[PDB]
């Protein structure tokens, strides 16, 4: 029988106890070892409802990453509640590891294996598992990095597409590698490189999926963000403990085989996890370099007025629940009783 149930999950990971890297440290304390051979059972002749936008699993992960960041990081200056505290702020090793979320006894995780599952509604190819796949808690706007990819063609999802207020989550099937670098020896000047040819073709195939959703006669266009905090206006992410803010105008203007985005490292940032402000030490001299798989996007549609035949889409993000959602959309917890 079972039924949708909220319960405290526990986590599993391949974290290393000798590693002082803060994700490894957190997981070492909070998680258990992963199963070598994880079992997966198919449920023949079974239909089950899913709702990625109303999934308690997302909330539990949200809580973990907030505490992870709140525990791990050490800004030189922090403002919270009109109060200012200052502390030692050494640089730290920062690199997310995959985390698995598992159901306790008396509960179980259902997994939707249906082709082209749009995020809500019937799933006919359902299976049960002990734990989710390994999920890297990547904090980022406006692209989803190091995530999972659909084997088939691109898939776009929304709680409701005719609702302009609701975010659109794009799941790619072919990833686009992006290398960000702060040149060795302005210490805040950085830049990201990715394939032009690969990004244009990506944008095109996204527009095709958007056309399926809004109509063939609709002409699709991509514009930069309408405004907001620096974090959501730019493509913001972490790389080697440093906080990057990359100008993504070249990624989201659409109607040189490499695309170079001008980036800036910022010491003074807004905290995504709480009200206030944090200040970190300036970046290390030497080499700061990362290489991430662009695996998804967060988009927002203008709407705003009577349809002009044209639909404008802009990069989104800001609510990290959507980041977790892009990985947990296929899972739901049930009380197996």
């Amino acid at each position, epitope marked *: 029988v079972w039924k949708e149930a909220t319960t405290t999950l526990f986590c599993a990971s391949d974290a290393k106890a000798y590693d002082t890297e803060v994700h490894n440290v957190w997981a070492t304390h909070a998680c258990v070892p992963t199963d070598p051979n994880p079992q997966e059972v198919k449920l023949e002749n079974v239909t089950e409802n899913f709702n990625m936008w109303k999934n308690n699993m997302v909330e539990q992960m949200h809580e973990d990453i907030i505490s992870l960041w709140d525990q791990s990081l050490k800004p030189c200056v922090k403002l919270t509640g009109g109060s200012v505290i200052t502390q030692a702020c050494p640089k730290v090793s920062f690199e997310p590891i995959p985390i698995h979320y598992c159901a306790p006894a008396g509960f179980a995780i259902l997994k939707c294996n249906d082709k082209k599952f749009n995020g809500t509604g019937p799933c006919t190819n359902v299976s049960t598992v002990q734990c989710t796949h390994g999920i890297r808690p990547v904090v980022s706007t406006q692209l989803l990095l190091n995530g999972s990819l659909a084997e088939e063609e691109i898939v776009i999802r929304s709680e409701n597409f005719t*609702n302009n207020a609701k975010t659109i989550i794009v799941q790619l099937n072919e990833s686009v590698v992006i290398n960000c670098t702060r040149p060795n020896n302005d210490i805040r000047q950085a830049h990201c490189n990715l394939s032009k040819t690969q990004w244009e073709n990506t944008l095109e195939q996204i527009a095709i999926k958007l056309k399926e959703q809004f109509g063939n006669n609709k002409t699709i266009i991509f514009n930069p963000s309408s405004g907001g905090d620096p974090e959501i206006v730019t493509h913001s992410f972490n790389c080697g403990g440093e906080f990057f803010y990359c100008n993504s105008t070249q990624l989201f203007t659409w109607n040189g085989r490499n695309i170079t985005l001008p980036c800036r490292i910022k010491q003074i940032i807004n905290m995504w996890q709480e009200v206030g402000k944090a200040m970190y030490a300036p970046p290390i001299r030497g080499q700061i370099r990362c290489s991430s798989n662009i695996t998804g996007l967060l988009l*927002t549609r203008d709407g*705003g007025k009577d349809t002009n035949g044209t639909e404008i889409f802009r990069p989104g993000g800001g609510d990290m629940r959507d980041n977790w959602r892009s990985e947990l959309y296929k899972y739901k917890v049930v009380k197996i009783e």
Partner: antibody
Amino acid sequence: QGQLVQSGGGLKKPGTSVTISCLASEYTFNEFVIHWIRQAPGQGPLWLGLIKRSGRLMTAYNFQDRLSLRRDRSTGTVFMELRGLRPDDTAVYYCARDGLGEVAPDYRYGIDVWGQGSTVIVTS
Amino acid sequence: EIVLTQSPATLSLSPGERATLSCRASQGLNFVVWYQQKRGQAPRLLIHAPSGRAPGVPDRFSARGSGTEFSLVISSVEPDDFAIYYCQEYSSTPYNFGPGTRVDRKR
């Protein structure tokens, strides 16, 4: 709980701009959308814009050239700037929160908490 | 965007009588929310989206509907209920309010 405390407004001359602030609880600022809504004398409420918890700004098409929204994550305050003021901008201006179907575990829409309102009077 | 219309303009009632306010939508909606407003005060949410009544709201208030037609029912009107009532739609921005239905005391 669950408070929205506004400040700003007053007598403005036509052509000028006005700024209204709205201090929210940390919980509200973190979890809820905050609308900007006005109500002129003898009229019903009119939606001007909102700020999602993600930070996304959305304004009414008829105000987008004169209206600007922003938030200060340092204190948990949101703002609206209305430029090129006209006599018919005279109204009580409200900030008001709304889950917009995004707050767990109920996921409800409905503007449940309103600020005290900021009176703006545009005239010469 | 949508267009909302309410009826009647005014509902005259004696205390104890059943009130039913109507809200009509130009196109199909999933739901609408209802607000109460007295003079000098800000709007007060009555009914949250699907579904039920806001905190502090008494049991006599109820609402239902789908698509074009929605309604707010007050089973037994009390003196505190005489006010203006608005419906509101969430299909997309800009979020429209209804013109309002005035509930006054019958004589």
